[PDB]
């Protein structure tokens, strides 16, 4: 809004449409699911404006789906009707702290009727605690926040594919009708010029058989197919005649080992493809088949009829014949052509609302099954709607989705941007969609229809390239699940503000200009040649009056995270992709500063996320502690915003919040009152501005490494706070109950000196490896209580305690201060899982300073580890004495081909040393003063729009007019370079260096976690080998490639030692350690246990595998 | 070509002392239990090897067959039980060769005794050529 | 370790490997969490579950070494024997090995000339087959 901080923008054109809510795709969909008041408001608002909207909420129609249910005879019936919600039992924070699910009770009016008697009995049924989504878009389940990512799937409809028989070099065409939930019928032609249907992926049969399996007869078939050779030929090849034999033979092929009967075959067909229950060609599918085949207005909630299959036959045989245009079956004029699988009419988005709808549908189907069982099994006059409804299926189905699905997964809370863009993904790898290996190329490649809907640049850098994506900045999910993008209606060549949202299929019929196309005071176009993106991804200029639409914004194509990057057009897409990916791993820092040079996108990105405390209504601030902000509203109410302080995240960071307003400030609705982690004044701040000089330096920033001054360690510029939880549970074993007791058995007084009276460590204490975070004791251990030991104890007179010390301890390699303790117990009202009596969760916090080993990065994919931290004097310094903060190799910039970081550096220096270019009558100065960036005070933050940013010439010109510091000192020359000095010798460097301010991000790849070491530790069960994973103190996988390497070296004894002694030789493993600790030769290896298990396994496979000697049986 | 192809196998059996009668099984060995362990998972659960499920299937059907033989059941029932025992041992040795696989807890197929030897993750290519080792460490790499 | 050979496993070889017969389709008691008897994970046929112990407890004392108990039938020795000790199950109806039959063509037997479909029918009790004919007496 107007209250955003000051940032000077270089934009030369004005976008008439502002970026919509960056979480609408989730919250609107889930409002449609619950059908709450917001969705009704949206529906009526859309109806007023004459848009297209879903008039039926998600659960309304789902209960309608399972509405009519009856027993065998239907003597009685059960129906469901209007549903509604009760307010949640707990608030969101209550759920977060107490390990609950943020859910609201759902209540429906289930009606039971006895049709023979005519009696109707209504009763309100508890349908369960439906989980709700937070305002952000996350869901709180079992104490943790989670995101349900929308799925990018193939839309239901009819696809007409083509291919080439390579052996015969012959055209082949195929047709396939996809349902929302039913089964397919693959229909192939031109194999031998012989059309053939394939039902349920069984063996193919001729069309004429199945078409004879319905009312159609041979005479009518020839009547309305009397022109196409292929199907006449199939009919001649057809042997079965008449309907009944057709049903019998389709039953035989589909269902072998079964009696052929008319009734069974008719029932099978009707159940499989013509039953509104088993087969669902939803309104998305109904619309697709209506538009493709031209079928005119069938039952909008219908299944495939005869007409659909006959229309597919007509279309496919006309594809074979070479026809290109025709009149669709009972409809308008369609074009005969083959369609793609990557196009964005042939792909759709299953949002969170529709996903939860599907899962509720499965749960209600199982509830319907149980209700039918109880309907037939039980008797009338004692049956009420409650009496036969079991809602456990529904509850378990929702829990299954929110606990096990691949599309519902933990929020990425590394920083506000990572969480925000976790909620704009368009995932493909998941249930009902593609897979890692099945996916080929054309799905993993950006399509001309991705423009404005899916981000070309943001994408995983691993196996999931092209599968997991990200919604564009202006994307809007259609009712049917397609994405739409806005476009200004260019009416007779004069632009207008009338924005129409178009999808890829309606986009491929129009000529689309560019937002940066030159335009005059009158909205008519200026230049004759106006470049346009035309159908098929074919850029091709036109007169201008010909033009029909224009892009609303020149960053419509880009996503949010990639829109962060300034000077994106000066980078190759590879490094832009890497930079956008790695910007999400940025740790939040103690003190956060928004970038000195950035895009006009940090404010809206942070505001539309959920880490920035905003104002619900206008008013005035009253009380501002660090923990809360109390405001007196202008409507006469009060609101107290409680702020989170050093709260652990899913990834171990902190969500500390800091206030922005003082206790006199006039607030407005939407204004930011406090900032979340990695935010400054409601503007994202993922890293810090560092002074960088591009140069080699004594081989320390060689090969992409990084050198930075010790200033950043002293000042805590790149420091962070990380919190680790150590949860322990007190069980009840067979021998008794476990208790959390301070008096640990047989320990020294100092170890538990820092333990509370209840056994837990004291808050504020500092912990090192081996420190007892929580003291616990087993009730006893059946270790030595044999009659011998019993006699020994009886004679002793002292019953030696047999308790096991299971005290929770700090994992080795961790330190910090105990920031918190939480205790759940069974004696109190706190819920616990069956078996555990007490649950102690201790939070230990630590401060990480940037050290040699960490990983820094910029917004251009320019990442490198930290190699050296110089004393502040050793680092090169400018003329007036200021040292530079970081040293980056200039080799990477041209070879990696990302010359946008140098532009960022120059503009950062330019912004730090503000300029004054008012009234120069030069072109760059003229542009900067007409825009309004001619005068800029030092330290001002500047905005570089991702396609309307600062020009290279402007940067150079401004560099000449940078406000001086000492007299007219302008350390940086117009060449972009400054004269530096050698901090280790003092001599000036031979030539100027390029210096300036660049935003450096501290990535969550932390050196502390990666350091993994082992001498001995946990082995595996079947194979007596070291286990994997760091937390297990695991070993390192010495793959077979390494065995090849050691064999090539000829290192025989080393390979033997490390294949047997270092792993998988029990006696060798024990004796090598014994020999080293005592001091002795390492023993000769033996037989690996892996070999023993191998021979036993293949013996169990009944192979007499005997290790034989040349004189008999060789030692096992 | 067919004659020489068959002659390969016939000569293989002829030259060696191992008789072809080993190709039909009357006893099935059971792999030692510790190679197919079941362990108490927290929450009162048990994580067990798929081999236990397959052995349970074959023993179930063998015992039911023995009962059916004792009662002198008709030919059809004993034939069905013998066919089922055959399919059970087939799944025990290779779950995927014939018919649909025997799924375990989820929809995923169970693990056969021969599925533990082949594949990328089999015994040979995951535990005998490449092993996790002691006295080993790792960390990020910096330039000195 | 001069060589390592594999051939066919006869019935006698399998019986020679084994120490007892698995007769029950039961692994352990869900309540007391112990091996059952003559089932999978059994302790009489496989090794003791605990070092130097036996099922019933008469020789739970560690002093005994290698003797056989007189009530449960579990010998007293180390608990690692369960990695090595094997058992068998005697089938009532003989069955074919899915490897040596119904497998890769060159190893599909061919000792008895039969198409894959014919063996599919014979093995899975769907068609009969003659094992003997008195041709001389028939003539």
């Amino acid at each position: 809004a107007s209250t955003a901080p000051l940032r000077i923008s270089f934009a030369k054109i004005k976008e008439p449409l502002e970026v919509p809510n960056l979480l609408a795709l989730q919250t609107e969909s889930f409002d449609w699911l619950l059908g709450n008041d917001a969705w009704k408001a949206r529906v009526e608002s859309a109806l007023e404006s004459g848009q297209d909207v879903p008039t039926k909420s998600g659960l309304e129609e789902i209960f309608e789906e399972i509405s009519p249910i009856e027993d065998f005879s239907g003597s009685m019936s059960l129906t469901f009707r209007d549903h509604r919600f009760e307010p949640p039992k707990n608030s969101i924070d209550e759920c977060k702290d107490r390990d609950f699910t943020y859910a609201a009770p759902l209540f429906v009016t289930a009606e039971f009727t006895n049709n023979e008697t005519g009696e109707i009995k209504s009763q309100t049924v508890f349908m369960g605690d439906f989980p709700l989504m937070t305002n952000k878009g996350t869901f709180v389940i079992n104490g943790t926040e989670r995101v349900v990512v929308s799925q990018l799937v193939r839309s239901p409809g009819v696809y007409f594919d083509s291919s080439i028989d390579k052996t015969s070099d012959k055209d082949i065409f195929s047709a396939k009708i996809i349902p929302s939930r039913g089964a397919w019928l693959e229909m192939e032609i031109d194999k031998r010029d012989m059309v053939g249907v394939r039902i349920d992926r069984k063996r193919k049969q001729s069309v004429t058989v199945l078409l004879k399996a319905l009312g159609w007869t041979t005479e009518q078939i020839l009547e309305e197919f009397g022109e196409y050779e292929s199907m006449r030929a199939t009919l001649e090849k057809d042997h079965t005649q008449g309907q009944d034999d057709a049903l019998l033979d389709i039953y035989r092929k589909l269902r072998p080992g079964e009696p052929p009967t008319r009734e069974a075959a008719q029932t099978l067909l009707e159940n499989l493809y013509f039953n509104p229950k088993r087969y669902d060609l939803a309104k998305v599918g109904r619309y697709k088949v209506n538009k493709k085949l031209g079928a005119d207005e069938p039952l909008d909630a219908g299944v495939l009829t005869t007409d659909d299959v006959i229309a597919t036959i007509k279309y496919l045989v006309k594809l074979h014949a070479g026809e290109t245009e025709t009149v669709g079956e009972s409809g308008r004029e369609i074009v005969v052509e083959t369609d793609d699988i990557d196009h964005f009419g042939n792909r759709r988005i299953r949002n969170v609302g529709e996903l939860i709808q599907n899962q509720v549908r499965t749960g209600l189907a199982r509830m319907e099954r149980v209700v039918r069982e109880r309907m037939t099994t039980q008797d009338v006059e004692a049956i009420t709607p409650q009496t036969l409804i079991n809602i456990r299926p529904v509850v378990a189905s929702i829990k299954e989705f929110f606990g096990t699905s691949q599309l519902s997964q933990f929020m990425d809370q590394n920083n506000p941007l990572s969480g925000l863009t976790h909620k704009r993904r368009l995932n493909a790898l998941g249930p009902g969609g593609l897979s890692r290996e099945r996916a080929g190329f054309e799905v993993r490649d950006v399509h001309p229809s991705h423009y404005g809907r899916m981000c070309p640049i943001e994408t995983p850098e691993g196996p999931n390239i092209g599968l997991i994506g990200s919604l564009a900045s202006y994307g809007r999910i259609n009712p049917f699940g397609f994405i739409e993008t806005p476009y200004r209606k260019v009416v007779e060549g004069q632009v207008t503000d009338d924005v129409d949202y178009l999808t890829a299929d309606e986009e491929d019929r129009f000529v689309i200009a560019q937002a940066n196309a030159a335009l005059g005071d009158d909205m008519r176009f200026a230049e004759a040649r106006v470049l346009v993106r035309r159908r098929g991804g074919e850029v091709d200029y036109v007169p201008g009056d010909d033009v029909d639409y224009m892009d609303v914004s020149p960053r419509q194509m880009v996503s949010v995270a990639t829109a962060m990057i300034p000077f994106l057009e000066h980078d190759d897409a590879n490094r832009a992709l890497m930079g956008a990916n790695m910007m999400r791993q940025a740790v939040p820092l103690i003190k956060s500063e928004s970038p000195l040079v950035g895009t006009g996108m940090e404010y809206r990105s942070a505001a539309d996320a959920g880490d920035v405390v905003k104002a619900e209504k206008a008013g005035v601030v009253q009380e501002v502690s660090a923990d809360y902000i109390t405001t007196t509203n202008d409507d006469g109410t009060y609101i107290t915003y409680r702020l989170a302080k050093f709260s652990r995240s899913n990834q171990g960071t902190s969500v500390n919040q800091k206030v922005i307003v003082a206790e006199g400030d006039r607030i407005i609705e939407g204004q930011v009152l406090a900032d979340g982690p990695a935010t400054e004044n409601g503007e994202m701040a993922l890293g810090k501005n560092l002074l960088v000089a591009f140069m080699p330096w004594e081989g320390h920033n060689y090969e992409d490494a990084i050198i930075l001054s010790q200033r950043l360690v002293q000042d805590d510029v790149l420091s962070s706070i990380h919190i680790e939880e150590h949860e322990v549970d007190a069980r009840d074993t067979k021998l008794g109950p476990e208790e959390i007791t301070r008096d640990i058995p047989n320990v020294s007084e100092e170890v538990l000196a820092d333990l509370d009276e209840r056994g837990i460590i004291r808050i504020g204490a500092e912990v090192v490896a081996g420190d007892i975070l929580v003291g616990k004791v087993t009730p006893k251990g059946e270790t030595e209580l044999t009659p011998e030991e019993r006699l020994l104890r009886a004679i002793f007179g002292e019953k030696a305690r047999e308790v096991r010390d299971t005290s929770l301890k700090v994992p080795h390699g961790e330190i910090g201060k105990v920031i918190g303790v939480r205790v759940f117990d069974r004696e109190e009202g706190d819920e616990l899982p069956p078996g555990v009596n007490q649950l102690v969760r201790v939070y230990v916090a630590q401060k990480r300073k940037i050290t040699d080993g960490d990983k820094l990065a910029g917004r251009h994919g320019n990442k490198g580890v930290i190699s050296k931290i110089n004393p502040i004097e050793d680092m090169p310094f400018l003329e007036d004495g200021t040292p530079v903060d970081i040293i980056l190799n200039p080799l990477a910039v041209p070879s990696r081909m990302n010359p946008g970081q140098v532009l960022e550096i120059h503009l950062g220096w330019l912004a730090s040393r503000g300029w004054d270019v008012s009234g120069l009558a030069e072109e760059w100065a003229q542009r900067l003063q007409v825009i309004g960036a001619d005068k800029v005070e030092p330290g001002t933050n500047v905005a570089t729009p991702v396609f309307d940013g600062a020009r290279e010439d402007e940067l150079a010109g401004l560099l000449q007019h940078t406000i001086p510091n000492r007299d007219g000192e302008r350390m940086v020359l117009p060449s972009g370079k400054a004269r530096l000095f050698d901090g280790r010798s003092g001599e000036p460097f031979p030539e100027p260096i390029s210096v300036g301010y660049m935003y450096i991000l501290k990535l969550h790849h932390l050196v502390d976690d990666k350091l993994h070491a082992r001498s001995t530790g946990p082995y595996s069960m079947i194979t007596q080998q070291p286990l994997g994973g760091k937390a297990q103190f695991g070993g390192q996988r010495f793959g077979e490639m390494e065995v090849w390497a050691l064999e090539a070296y000829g290192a025989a004894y080393a390979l033997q030692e490390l294949l047997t002694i270092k792993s998988d030789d029990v006696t060798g493993r024990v004796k090598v350690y014994e020999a080293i600790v005592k001091g002795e030769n390492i023993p000769e290896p033996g037989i690996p246990e892996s070999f023993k298990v191998l021979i036993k396994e293949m013996q169990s496979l009944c192979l007499n595998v005997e290790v034989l000697s040349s004189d008999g049986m060789s030692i096992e | 070509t067919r004659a020489l192809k068959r002659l390969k196998v016939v000569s293989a059996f002829l030259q060696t002392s191992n008789s072809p009668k080993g190709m039909v099984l009357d006893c099935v060995p059971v792999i030692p239990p510790d190679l197919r362990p079941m362990v108490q998972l927290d929450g009162g659960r048990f994580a067990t090897s798929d081999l236990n499920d397959l052995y349970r299937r074959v023993i179930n059907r063998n015992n039911r067959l023995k009962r059916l033989l004792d009662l002198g059941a008709p030919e059809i029932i004993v034939n069905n039980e013998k066919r089922m025992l055959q399919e059970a041992v087939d799944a025990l040795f290779d779950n995927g060769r014939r018919g649909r696989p025997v799924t375990g807890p989820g929809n995923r197929p169970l693990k056969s005794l021969s599925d533990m030897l082949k594949g990328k993750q089999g015994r040979f290519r995951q535990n005998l050529l490449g092993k996790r080792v002691d006295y080993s460490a790792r960390s990020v790499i910096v330039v000195g | 370790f001069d060589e390592l050979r594999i051939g066919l496993a006869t019935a006698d070889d399998i019986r020679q490997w084994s120490h007892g017969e698995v007769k029950k389709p039961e692994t352990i008691n869900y309540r007391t969490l112990k091996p059952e008897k003559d089932g999978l994970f059994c302790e009489k046929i496989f090794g003791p579950t605990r070092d130097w112990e036996c099922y019933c407890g008469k020789y739970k004392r560690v002093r005994f070494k290698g003797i056989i108990c007189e009530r449960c039938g579990v010998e007293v020795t180390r608990a690692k024997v369960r990695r090595e000790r094997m058992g068998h199950i005697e089938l009532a109806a003989p069955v074919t090995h899915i490897w040596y039959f119904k497998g890769v063509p060159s190893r599909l037997g061919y000792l008895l000339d039969l198409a894959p479909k014919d063996l599919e029918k014979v093995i899975y009790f769907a068609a009969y087959m003659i094992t003997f004919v008195d041709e001389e007496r028939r003539t």
Binding site: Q1032 | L41, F46, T48 | -
Partner: peptide, 26 residues
Amino acid sequence: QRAAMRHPGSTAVPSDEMPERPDDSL
């Protein structure tokens, strides 16, 4: 169903007994 619903804890998952469960004696 009776035999199934009672104590349904035996999950035949070899991805926890082998990889995640280590030997008690190291």
